[PDB]
mmCIF file of C-alpha atoms and ligand atoms in Angstrom:
data_model
loop_
_atom_site.group_PDB
_atom_site.id
_atom_site.type_symbol
_atom_site.label_atom_id
_atom_site.label_comp_id
_atom_site.label_asym_id
_atom_site.label_seq_id
_atom_site.Cartn_x
_atom_site.Cartn_y
_atom_site.Cartn_z
ATOM 1 C CA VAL A 10 -0.532 -30.097 73.875
ATOM 2 C CA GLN A 11 -3.010 -32.751 75.031
ATOM 3 C CA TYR A 12 -2.418 -33.844 78.629
ATOM 4 C CA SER A 13 -3.701 -37.018 80.285
ATOM 5 C CA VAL A 14 -4.265 -37.898 83.932
ATOM 6 C CA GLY A 15 -1.086 -39.485 85.309
ATOM 7 C CA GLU A 16 1.540 -37.365 83.552
ATOM 8 C CA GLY A 17 3.804 -34.952 85.405
ATOM 9 C CA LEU A 18 4.698 -31.261 85.149
ATOM 10 C CA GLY A 19 7.711 -29.241 86.245
ATOM 11 C CA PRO A 20 10.585 -31.709 86.553
ATOM 12 C CA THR A 21 12.981 -31.361 89.482
ATOM 13 C CA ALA A 22 15.890 -33.366 90.865
ATOM 14 C CA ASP A 23 13.886 -35.347 93.429
ATOM 15 C CA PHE A 24 11.085 -35.819 90.859
ATOM 16 C CA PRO A 25 12.514 -36.113 87.323
ATOM 17 C CA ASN A 26 9.040 -36.908 85.923
ATOM 18 C CA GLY A 27 7.401 -33.742 87.293
ATOM 19 C CA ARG A 28 6.882 -32.161 90.690
ATOM 20 C CA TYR A 29 3.136 -31.836 90.017
ATOM 21 C CA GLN A 30 1.148 -34.939 89.049
ATOM 22 C CA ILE A 31 -2.066 -34.533 87.065
ATOM 23 C CA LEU A 32 -5.119 -35.907 88.877
ATOM 24 C CA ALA A 33 -8.104 -34.326 87.096
ATOM 25 C CA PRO A 34 -9.099 -31.505 84.728
ATOM 26 C CA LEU A 35 -10.221 -28.307 86.434
ATOM 27 C CA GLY A 36 -10.926 -25.778 83.691
ATOM 28 C CA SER A 37 -10.071 -24.309 80.332
ATOM 29 C CA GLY A 38 -9.845 -20.990 78.539
ATOM 30 C CA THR A 39 -8.200 -19.109 75.704
ATOM 31 C CA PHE A 40 -5.070 -18.933 77.877
ATOM 32 C CA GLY A 41 -4.820 -22.723 78.073
ATOM 33 C CA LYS A 42 -5.870 -25.381 80.587
ATOM 34 C CA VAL A 43 -6.114 -25.507 84.392
ATOM 35 C CA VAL A 44 -5.499 -28.933 85.895
ATOM 36 C CA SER A 45 -5.798 -30.350 89.408
ATOM 37 C CA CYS A 46 -2.429 -31.654 90.586
ATOM 38 C CA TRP A 47 -0.723 -33.411 93.477
ATOM 39 C CA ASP A 48 2.409 -31.555 94.595
ATOM 40 C CA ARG A 49 5.008 -34.256 95.248
ATOM 41 C CA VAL A 50 7.057 -31.796 97.337
ATOM 42 C CA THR A 51 4.428 -30.544 99.796
ATOM 43 C CA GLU A 52 2.011 -33.483 99.290
ATOM 44 C CA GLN A 53 -1.017 -31.223 98.881
ATOM 45 C CA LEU A 54 -3.551 -30.491 96.167
ATOM 46 C CA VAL A 55 -2.753 -27.535 93.913
ATOM 47 C CA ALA A 56 -4.185 -26.077 90.715
ATOM 48 C CA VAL A 57 -1.686 -25.730 87.868
ATOM 49 C CA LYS A 58 -2.663 -23.284 85.126
ATOM 50 C CA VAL A 59 -0.734 -24.176 81.958
ATOM 51 C CA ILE A 60 -0.641 -21.460 79.288
ATOM 52 C CA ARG A 61 -0.811 -22.163 75.566
ATOM 53 C CA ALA A 62 2.461 -22.153 73.637
ATOM 54 C CA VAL A 63 1.744 -18.691 72.196
ATOM 55 C CA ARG A 64 3.589 -15.437 72.814
ATOM 56 C CA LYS A 65 0.607 -13.216 73.694
ATOM 57 C CA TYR A 66 -0.751 -15.598 76.329
ATOM 58 C CA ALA A 67 2.794 -15.934 77.686
ATOM 59 C CA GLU A 68 2.982 -12.157 78.182
ATOM 60 C CA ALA A 69 -0.440 -12.274 79.842
ATOM 61 C CA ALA A 70 0.702 -15.094 82.133
ATOM 62 C CA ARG A 71 3.824 -13.176 83.167
ATOM 63 C CA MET A 72 1.681 -10.137 83.955
ATOM 64 C CA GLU A 73 -0.542 -12.407 86.054
ATOM 65 C CA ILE A 74 2.521 -13.756 87.881
ATOM 66 C CA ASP A 75 3.758 -10.249 88.674
ATOM 67 C CA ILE A 76 0.372 -8.972 89.855
ATOM 68 C CA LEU A 77 -0.247 -12.056 91.988
ATOM 69 C CA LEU A 78 3.181 -11.681 93.585
ATOM 70 C CA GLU A 79 2.164 -8.166 94.622
ATOM 71 C CA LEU A 80 -1.272 -9.359 95.783
ATOM 72 C CA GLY A 81 0.062 -12.260 97.840
ATOM 73 C CA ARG A 82 2.643 -9.946 99.375
ATOM 74 C CA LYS A 83 0.055 -7.358 100.447
ATOM 75 C CA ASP A 84 -2.541 -9.929 101.585
ATOM 76 C CA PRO A 85 -1.174 -13.424 102.328
ATOM 77 C CA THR A 86 -4.223 -14.677 104.221
ATOM 78 C CA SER A 87 -6.313 -13.413 101.264
ATOM 79 C CA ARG A 88 -8.709 -11.477 103.475
ATOM 80 C CA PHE A 89 -9.821 -9.741 100.255
ATOM 81 C CA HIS A 90 -10.756 -12.912 98.342
ATOM 82 C CA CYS A 91 -8.045 -12.969 95.646
ATOM 83 C CA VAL A 92 -6.617 -16.298 94.520
ATOM 84 C CA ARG A 93 -3.299 -17.180 96.153
ATOM 85 C CA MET A 94 -0.493 -17.996 93.717
ATOM 86 C CA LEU A 95 1.818 -20.530 95.343
ATOM 87 C CA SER A 96 4.453 -20.913 92.623
ATOM 88 C CA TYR A 97 5.289 -20.526 88.939
ATOM 89 C CA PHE A 98 7.605 -22.271 86.485
ATOM 90 C CA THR A 99 8.035 -23.202 82.813
ATOM 91 C CA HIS A 100 7.253 -26.699 81.531
ATOM 92 C CA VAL A 101 9.077 -27.797 78.380
ATOM 93 C CA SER A 102 7.361 -30.350 76.151
ATOM 94 C CA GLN A 103 8.670 -33.354 74.239
ATOM 95 C CA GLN A 104 8.522 -31.214 71.077
ATOM 96 C CA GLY A 105 10.490 -28.327 72.593
ATOM 97 C CA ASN A 106 7.363 -26.296 73.387
ATOM 98 C CA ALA A 107 7.663 -24.091 76.486
ATOM 99 C CA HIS A 108 4.513 -23.382 78.509
ATOM 100 C CA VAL A 109 4.245 -20.996 81.446
ATOM 101 C CA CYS A 110 2.668 -22.603 84.515
ATOM 102 C CA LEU A 111 1.164 -20.890 87.552
ATOM 103 C CA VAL A 112 0.541 -22.978 90.680
ATOM 104 C CA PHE A 113 -2.422 -21.709 92.724
ATOM 105 C CA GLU A 114 -4.262 -22.906 95.782
ATOM 106 C CA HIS A 115 -6.764 -25.609 94.854
ATOM 107 C CA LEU A 116 -10.299 -24.178 94.784
ATOM 108 C CA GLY A 117 -13.724 -25.547 93.946
ATOM 109 C CA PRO A 118 -15.991 -24.901 90.975
ATOM 110 C CA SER A 119 -16.774 -21.556 89.407
ATOM 111 C CA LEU A 120 -19.930 -19.503 89.783
ATOM 112 C CA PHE A 121 -20.645 -20.447 86.168
ATOM 113 C CA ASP A 122 -20.264 -24.104 87.157
ATOM 114 C CA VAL A 123 -22.845 -23.550 89.903
ATOM 115 C CA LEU A 124 -25.286 -21.823 87.553
ATOM 116 C CA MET A 125 -24.965 -24.637 85.007
ATOM 117 C CA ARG A 126 -25.230 -27.490 87.532
ATOM 118 C CA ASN A 127 -28.567 -26.020 88.677
ATOM 119 C CA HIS A 128 -29.796 -25.790 85.045
ATOM 120 C CA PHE A 129 -29.304 -21.999 84.989
ATOM 121 C CA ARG A 130 -32.097 -21.473 87.489
ATOM 122 C CA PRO A 131 -31.964 -18.088 89.255
ATOM 123 C CA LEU A 132 -29.543 -17.988 92.198
ATOM 124 C CA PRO A 133 -31.345 -17.101 95.464
ATOM 125 C CA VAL A 134 -30.992 -13.505 96.598
ATOM 126 C CA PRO A 135 -29.192 -14.204 99.931
ATOM 127 C CA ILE A 136 -26.480 -16.304 98.261
ATOM 128 C CA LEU A 137 -26.331 -13.672 95.519
ATOM 129 C CA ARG A 138 -25.760 -11.060 98.234
ATOM 130 C CA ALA A 139 -23.009 -13.031 99.975
ATOM 131 C CA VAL A 140 -21.166 -13.618 96.698
ATOM 132 C CA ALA A 141 -21.637 -10.011 95.571
ATOM 133 C CA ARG A 142 -20.362 -8.658 98.892
ATOM 134 C CA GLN A 143 -17.202 -10.772 98.779
ATOM 135 C CA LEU A 144 -16.628 -9.986 95.087
ATOM 136 C CA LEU A 145 -17.153 -6.276 95.773
ATOM 137 C CA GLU A 146 -14.652 -6.527 98.624
ATOM 138 C CA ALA A 147 -12.115 -8.014 96.207
ATOM 139 C CA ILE A 148 -12.797 -5.302 93.620
ATOM 140 C CA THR A 149 -12.456 -2.617 96.303
ATOM 141 C CA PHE A 150 -9.147 -4.190 97.342
ATOM 142 C CA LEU A 151 -7.797 -4.168 93.785
ATOM 143 C CA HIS A 152 -9.042 -0.744 92.684
ATOM 144 C CA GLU A 153 -8.370 1.256 95.838
ATOM 145 C CA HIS A 154 -5.502 -0.535 97.654
ATOM 146 C CA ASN A 155 -3.569 -1.451 94.492
ATOM 147 C CA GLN A 156 -4.855 0.773 91.635
ATOM 148 C CA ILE A 157 -5.365 -2.423 89.613
ATOM 149 C CA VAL A 158 -8.280 -3.050 87.237
ATOM 150 C CA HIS A 159 -9.307 -6.629 86.493
ATOM 151 C CA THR A 160 -11.225 -6.149 83.184
ATOM 152 C CA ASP A 161 -12.332 -9.787 83.157
ATOM 153 C CA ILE A 162 -15.081 -9.936 85.795
ATOM 154 C CA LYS A 163 -17.169 -12.934 84.701
ATOM 155 C CA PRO A 164 -18.879 -15.833 86.511
ATOM 156 C CA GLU A 165 -16.114 -18.175 85.314
ATOM 157 C CA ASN A 166 -13.545 -16.142 87.301
ATOM 158 C CA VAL A 167 -15.346 -16.441 90.656
ATOM 159 C CA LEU A 168 -14.570 -19.737 92.385
ATOM 160 C CA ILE A 169 -16.049 -21.418 95.453
ATOM 161 C CA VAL A 170 -13.690 -22.087 98.362
ATOM 162 C CA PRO A 171 -14.140 -25.856 98.816
ATOM 163 C CA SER A 172 -14.650 -25.570 102.585
ATOM 164 C CA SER A 173 -17.911 -23.754 101.846
ATOM 165 C CA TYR A 174 -18.803 -26.377 99.229
ATOM 166 C CA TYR A 175 -20.450 -29.597 100.364
ATOM 167 C CA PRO A 176 -20.848 -33.122 98.942
ATOM 168 C CA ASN A 177 -24.533 -32.351 98.338
ATOM 169 C CA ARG A 178 -23.155 -29.738 95.889
ATOM 170 C CA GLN A 179 -25.673 -27.065 96.950
ATOM 171 C CA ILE A 180 -24.080 -23.799 98.066
ATOM 172 C CA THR A 181 -25.616 -21.733 100.871
ATOM 173 C CA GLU A 182 -25.401 -18.120 102.029
ATOM 174 C CA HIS A 183 -22.211 -19.007 103.943
ATOM 175 C CA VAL A 184 -20.306 -19.706 100.714
ATOM 176 C CA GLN A 185 -16.796 -18.259 100.433
ATOM 177 C CA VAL A 186 -15.532 -17.182 97.012
ATOM 178 C CA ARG A 187 -12.245 -16.140 95.426
ATOM 179 C CA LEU A 188 -11.625 -13.938 92.388
ATOM 180 C CA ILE A 189 -9.163 -15.405 89.886
ATOM 181 C CA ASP A 190 -7.533 -14.731 86.502
ATOM 182 C CA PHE A 191 -5.259 -11.686 86.533
ATOM 183 C CA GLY A 192 -3.865 -12.351 83.049
ATOM 184 C CA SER A 193 -5.713 -9.331 81.645
ATOM 185 C CA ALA A 194 -5.343 -6.946 84.594
ATOM 186 C CA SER A 195 -3.632 -3.567 84.354
ATOM 187 C CA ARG A 196 -2.076 -1.207 86.886
ATOM 188 C CA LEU A 197 -3.501 2.308 86.553
ATOM 189 C CA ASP A 198 -1.239 4.160 88.996
ATOM 190 C CA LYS A 199 0.645 5.923 86.174
ATOM 191 C CA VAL A 200 -1.786 5.739 83.224
ATOM 192 C CA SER A 201 -5.380 5.506 84.422
ATOM 193 C CA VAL A 202 -7.224 5.572 81.052
ATOM 194 C CA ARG A 203 -6.673 2.994 78.293
ATOM 195 C CA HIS A 204 -8.245 2.236 74.915
ATOM 196 C CA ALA A 205 -7.369 -1.398 74.123
ATOM 197 C CA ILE A 206 -10.144 -3.932 73.590
ATOM 198 C CA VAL A 207 -10.533 -5.809 76.886
ATOM 199 C CA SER A 208 -13.238 -7.745 78.775
ATOM 200 C CA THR A 209 -15.176 -10.803 77.669
ATOM 201 C CA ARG A 210 -17.790 -9.684 75.127
ATOM 202 C CA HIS A 211 -20.839 -10.359 77.299
ATOM 203 C CA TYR A 212 -19.430 -8.217 80.139
ATOM 204 C CA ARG A 213 -17.700 -5.527 78.065
ATOM 205 C CA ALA A 214 -18.438 -1.950 79.102
ATOM 206 C CA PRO A 215 -19.805 0.432 76.440
ATOM 207 C CA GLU A 216 -16.902 2.891 76.703
ATOM 208 C CA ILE A 217 -14.582 0.088 75.582
ATOM 209 C CA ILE A 218 -16.640 -0.415 72.416
ATOM 210 C CA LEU A 219 -17.170 3.293 71.722
ATOM 211 C CA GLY A 220 -13.561 4.367 72.296
ATOM 212 C CA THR A 221 -13.970 7.137 74.904
ATOM 213 C CA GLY A 222 -11.304 5.622 77.189
ATOM 214 C CA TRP A 223 -11.904 3.025 79.898
ATOM 215 C CA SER A 224 -10.601 2.818 83.457
ATOM 216 C CA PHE A 225 -11.691 1.289 86.777
ATOM 217 C CA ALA A 226 -15.379 1.983 86.102
ATOM 218 C CA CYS A 227 -15.542 -0.744 83.442
ATOM 219 C CA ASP A 228 -15.160 -3.421 86.121
ATOM 220 C CA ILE A 229 -18.260 -2.055 87.857
ATOM 221 C CA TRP A 230 -20.208 -2.479 84.615
ATOM 222 C CA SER A 231 -19.041 -6.086 84.417
ATOM 223 C CA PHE A 232 -20.021 -6.517 88.060
ATOM 224 C CA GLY A 233 -23.490 -5.191 87.292
ATOM 225 C CA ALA A 234 -23.862 -7.589 84.380
ATOM 226 C CA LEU A 235 -22.789 -10.507 86.560
ATOM 227 C CA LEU A 236 -25.350 -9.571 89.201
ATOM 228 C CA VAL A 237 -28.195 -9.515 86.680
ATOM 229 C CA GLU A 238 -27.017 -12.910 85.449
ATOM 230 C CA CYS A 239 -27.091 -14.325 88.980
ATOM 231 C CA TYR A 240 -30.610 -12.974 89.365
ATOM 232 C CA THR A 241 -31.898 -14.766 86.251
ATOM 233 C CA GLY A 242 -29.399 -17.562 85.593
ATOM 234 C CA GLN A 243 -29.033 -16.256 82.028
ATOM 235 C CA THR A 244 -26.383 -14.187 80.283
ATOM 236 C CA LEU A 245 -27.638 -10.617 79.978
ATOM 237 C CA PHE A 246 -26.048 -9.541 76.670
ATOM 238 C CA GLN A 247 -26.168 -12.460 74.210
ATOM 239 C CA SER A 248 -24.569 -10.991 71.084
ATOM 240 C CA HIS A 249 -21.173 -10.812 69.383
ATOM 241 C CA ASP A 250 -21.937 -7.756 67.211
ATOM 242 C CA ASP A 251 -21.094 -4.248 68.392
ATOM 243 C CA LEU A 252 -24.163 -2.536 66.920
ATOM 244 C CA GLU A 253 -26.497 -5.186 68.341
ATOM 245 C CA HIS A 254 -24.685 -5.104 71.696
ATOM 246 C CA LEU A 255 -25.016 -1.327 72.029
ATOM 247 C CA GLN A 256 -28.668 -1.560 70.997
ATOM 248 C CA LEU A 257 -29.272 -4.220 73.656
ATOM 249 C CA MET A 258 -27.678 -1.882 76.199
ATOM 250 C CA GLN A 259 -29.938 0.960 75.054
ATOM 251 C CA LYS A 260 -33.005 -1.297 75.249
ATOM 252 C CA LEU A 261 -32.225 -2.671 78.718
ATOM 253 C CA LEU A 262 -31.882 0.901 80.040
ATOM 254 C CA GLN A 263 -34.188 2.928 77.772
ATOM 255 C CA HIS A 264 -36.611 3.796 80.593
ATOM 256 C CA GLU A 265 -33.732 4.535 82.979
ATOM 257 C CA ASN A 266 -33.266 8.285 83.439
ATOM 258 C CA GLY A 267 -30.510 9.602 81.191
ATOM 259 C CA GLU A 268 -29.127 6.379 79.685
ATOM 260 C CA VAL A 269 -28.591 6.877 75.939
ATOM 261 C CA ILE A 270 -25.825 5.419 73.762
ATOM 262 C CA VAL A 271 -23.851 8.435 72.526
ATOM 263 C CA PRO A 272 -21.119 8.292 69.839
ATOM 264 C CA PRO A 273 -17.550 9.295 70.724
ATOM 265 C CA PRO A 274 -16.166 12.724 69.804
ATOM 266 C CA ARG A 275 -14.912 12.608 66.236
ATOM 267 C CA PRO A 276 -11.092 12.841 66.238
ATOM 268 C CA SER A 277 -8.971 14.784 63.789
ATOM 269 C CA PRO A 278 -8.195 13.132 60.433
ATOM 270 C CA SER A 279 -4.499 13.501 61.305
ATOM 271 C CA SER A 280 -4.871 11.214 64.344
ATOM 272 C CA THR A 281 -3.219 7.782 64.255
ATOM 273 C CA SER A 282 -3.657 6.793 67.911
ATOM 274 C CA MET A 283 -5.253 3.480 68.869
ATOM 275 C CA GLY A 284 -8.046 5.447 70.533
ATOM 276 C CA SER A 285 -8.778 7.463 67.399
ATOM 277 C CA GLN A 286 -8.928 4.294 65.293
ATOM 278 C CA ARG A 287 -11.369 2.732 67.751
ATOM 279 C CA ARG A 288 -13.419 5.945 67.678
ATOM 280 C CA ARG A 289 -13.556 5.818 63.869
ATOM 281 C CA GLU A 290 -14.682 2.185 63.865
ATOM 282 C CA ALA A 291 -17.306 3.111 66.470
ATOM 283 C CA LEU A 292 -18.573 6.161 64.568
ATOM 284 C CA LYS A 293 -19.048 3.795 61.630
ATOM 285 C CA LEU A 294 -21.880 2.361 63.785
ATOM 286 C CA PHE A 295 -23.760 5.677 64.081
ATOM 287 C CA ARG A 296 -25.827 7.870 61.766
ATOM 288 C CA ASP A 297 -26.315 11.547 62.690
ATOM 289 C CA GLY A 298 -25.636 10.832 66.355
ATOM 290 C CA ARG A 299 -28.087 7.931 66.671
ATOM 291 C CA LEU A 300 -27.163 4.257 66.797
ATOM 292 C CA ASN A 301 -27.681 2.903 63.277
ATOM 293 C CA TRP A 302 -30.068 0.158 64.398
ATOM 294 C CA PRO A 303 -31.687 -1.822 62.909
ATOM 295 C CA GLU A 304 -30.833 -0.540 59.418
ATOM 296 C CA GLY A 305 -27.115 -0.959 60.114
ATOM 297 C CA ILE A 306 -27.394 -4.700 60.755
ATOM 298 C CA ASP A 307 -27.590 -5.422 57.011
ATOM 299 C CA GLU A 308 -26.794 -2.135 55.274
ATOM 300 C CA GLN A 309 -26.646 -3.472 51.713
ATOM 301 C CA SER A 310 -29.698 -5.742 51.985
ATOM 302 C CA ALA A 311 -33.073 -4.016 51.842
ATOM 303 C CA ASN A 312 -34.826 -7.188 53.084
ATOM 304 C CA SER A 313 -32.604 -9.177 55.446
ATOM 305 C CA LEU A 314 -33.275 -12.190 57.650
ATOM 306 C CA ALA A 315 -30.347 -11.293 59.920
ATOM 307 C CA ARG A 316 -31.893 -7.875 60.565
ATOM 308 C CA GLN A 317 -35.240 -9.490 61.395
ATOM 309 C CA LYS A 318 -33.556 -11.863 63.840
ATOM 310 C CA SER A 319 -31.754 -8.906 65.414
ATOM 311 C CA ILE A 320 -35.099 -7.114 65.780
ATOM 312 C CA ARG A 321 -36.557 -10.196 67.482
ATOM 313 C CA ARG A 322 -33.530 -10.599 69.768
ATOM 314 C CA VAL A 323 -33.666 -6.950 70.850
ATOM 315 C CA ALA A 324 -37.419 -7.224 71.445
ATOM 316 C CA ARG A 325 -36.769 -10.213 73.721
ATOM 317 C CA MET A 326 -34.419 -8.041 75.816
ATOM 318 C CA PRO A 327 -36.369 -6.892 78.895
ATOM 319 C CA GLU A 328 -36.313 -3.472 80.460
ATOM 320 C CA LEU A 329 -34.123 -3.469 83.564
ATOM 321 C CA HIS A 330 -36.933 -2.515 85.956
ATOM 322 C CA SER A 331 -39.115 -5.396 84.727
ATOM 323 C CA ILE A 332 -36.546 -8.123 85.465
ATOM 324 C CA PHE A 333 -36.823 -7.886 89.248
ATOM 325 C CA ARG A 334 -39.758 -8.809 91.461
ATOM 326 C CA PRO A 335 -41.063 -5.995 93.691
ATOM 327 C CA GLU A 336 -39.611 -7.447 96.905
ATOM 328 C CA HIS A 337 -36.115 -7.163 95.388
ATOM 329 C CA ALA A 338 -36.441 -3.427 94.615
ATOM 330 C CA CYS A 339 -33.296 -2.670 96.644
ATOM 331 C CA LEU A 340 -31.211 -4.978 94.451
ATOM 332 C CA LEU A 341 -32.597 -3.191 91.393
ATOM 333 C CA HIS A 342 -31.296 0.113 92.742
ATOM 334 C CA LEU A 343 -27.921 -1.493 93.448
ATOM 335 C CA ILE A 344 -27.664 -2.640 89.842
ATOM 336 C CA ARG A 345 -28.745 0.804 88.657
ATOM 337 C CA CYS A 346 -25.651 2.134 90.447
ATOM 338 C CA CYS A 347 -23.527 -0.166 88.227
ATOM 339 C CA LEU A 348 -25.236 -0.496 84.821
ATOM 340 C CA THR A 349 -24.877 3.064 83.589
ATOM 341 C CA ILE A 350 -23.660 3.876 80.091
ATOM 342 C CA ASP A 351 -21.554 6.819 81.266
ATOM 343 C CA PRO A 352 -18.666 5.324 83.291
ATOM 344 C CA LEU A 353 -18.483 8.614 85.227
ATOM 345 C CA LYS A 354 -21.877 7.771 86.780
ATOM 346 C CA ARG A 355 -20.994 4.317 88.144
ATOM 347 C CA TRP A 356 -20.358 4.044 91.879
ATOM 348 C CA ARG A 357 -17.024 3.131 93.368
ATOM 349 C CA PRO A 358 -16.869 -0.411 94.793
ATOM 350 C CA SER A 359 -16.342 0.955 98.312
ATOM 351 C CA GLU A 360 -19.519 3.019 97.907
ATOM 352 C CA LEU A 361 -21.396 -0.028 96.596
ATOM 353 C CA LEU A 362 -20.297 -1.977 99.686
ATOM 354 C CA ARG A 363 -22.260 0.601 101.713
ATOM 355 C CA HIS A 364 -25.451 0.257 99.658
ATOM 356 C CA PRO A 365 -28.665 -0.689 101.510
ATOM 357 C CA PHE A 366 -28.661 -4.054 99.696
ATOM 358 C CA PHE A 367 -25.655 -5.029 101.850
ATOM 359 C CA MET A 368 -25.688 -2.971 105.055
ATOM 360 C CA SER A 369 -29.430 -3.379 105.655
ATOM 361 C CA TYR A 370 -28.917 -7.158 105.792
HETATM 362 N N1 ADN B 401 -7.503 -22.629 91.613
HETATM 363 C C1 ADN B 401 -8.461 -23.146 90.836
HETATM 364 N N2 ADN B 401 -9.228 -24.144 91.332
HETATM 365 C C2 ADN B 401 -10.187 -24.663 90.561
HETATM 366 N N3 ADN B 401 -10.525 -24.335 89.312
HETATM 367 C C3 ADN B 401 -9.751 -23.349 88.846
HETATM 368 C C4 ADN B 401 -8.720 -22.715 89.521
HETATM 369 N N4 ADN B 401 -8.143 -21.735 88.728
HETATM 370 C C5 ADN B 401 -8.820 -21.804 87.609
HETATM 371 N N5 ADN B 401 -9.805 -22.758 87.607
HETATM 372 C C6 ADN B 401 -10.732 -23.065 86.513
HETATM 373 O O1 ADN B 401 -10.070 -22.792 85.286
HETATM 374 C C7 ADN B 401 -10.764 -21.745 84.574
HETATM 375 C C8 ADN B 401 -10.039 -20.439 84.793
HETATM 376 O O2 ADN B 401 -10.353 -19.482 83.789
HETATM 377 C C9 ADN B 401 -12.191 -21.793 85.086
HETATM 378 O O3 ADN B 401 -12.910 -22.807 84.386
HETATM 379 C C10 ADN B 401 -12.012 -22.212 86.546
HETATM 380 O O4 ADN B 401 -13.097 -22.935 87.088
#
């Protein structure tokens, strides 16, 4: 439903027109819309995330509510940089539509907002380091103190604490950030390996595409991607095709020791599991163990313009080592610890927090 500035949300006795009054738009996503609100009870600014009137996003929102209850219980000050959820309710519409609403602390713009406002110019390395350290602290918190995996590490889900922000709208190395959006997170304390399609495309780890089971390590891959983005201001993997995405991965890391896209083990024909179906769809992308690129881009067409554009796009993809200037060699190594095709090779976030890129500063 379309919402305008001035309308209310969450009606109570003292405020029959809504406890939370809309002041400004804050953000949007497939889940719904996040709106800046004035809490008529506490007379403070809050951020109300309203979920779309769909069942799947409602389940996701309830999972986010549960996880954020646990996270606010185990860290109320938010020493580990996770967004504080103040409240949650259900707003009914004039048409009978029920929307889940989560009330969070009011934060500033996203890291994506920062990158856009500066015309996608590369983020300086010291600010990059501050943000990466705090984000890595949050990921360490989740993974190792809660056995929770986020799966949606993206620049849109890292927000600036407004106290660090300034009216000149230029962040410094003292910026404070918070990780948000736990509507896709999963607890791995009982089942640590999953096979469902998760992660935003551009930050999706290869094991998720290939079907060899993902776990905590996938977040690290996303983290790595994000870092490269912050170094260049540009999205690393710009593709929505699985074959092209895996080829871009292979190209970015071709001259990295031991990084080759390998197909999953072929399951039995009498296997109906979600993982086996993903593995079959993934094997459909390979020919004799090699990634069917570029001939697989347009199989039927012998002379295709889409295949030629895919060839050009993969050629434009740089080798990882060539992206970074020499003086930033350390950062390169840090990202090598994250952008590995085998999830078993990626470092733990606690180990990454002890990398020279951080503890030599
Ligand atoms: N607490 C918050 N403060 C400010 N913006 C937020 C908050 N939570 C979510 N958003 C915005 O809504 C979207 C969340 O996916 C992003 O665009 C993000 O900037």
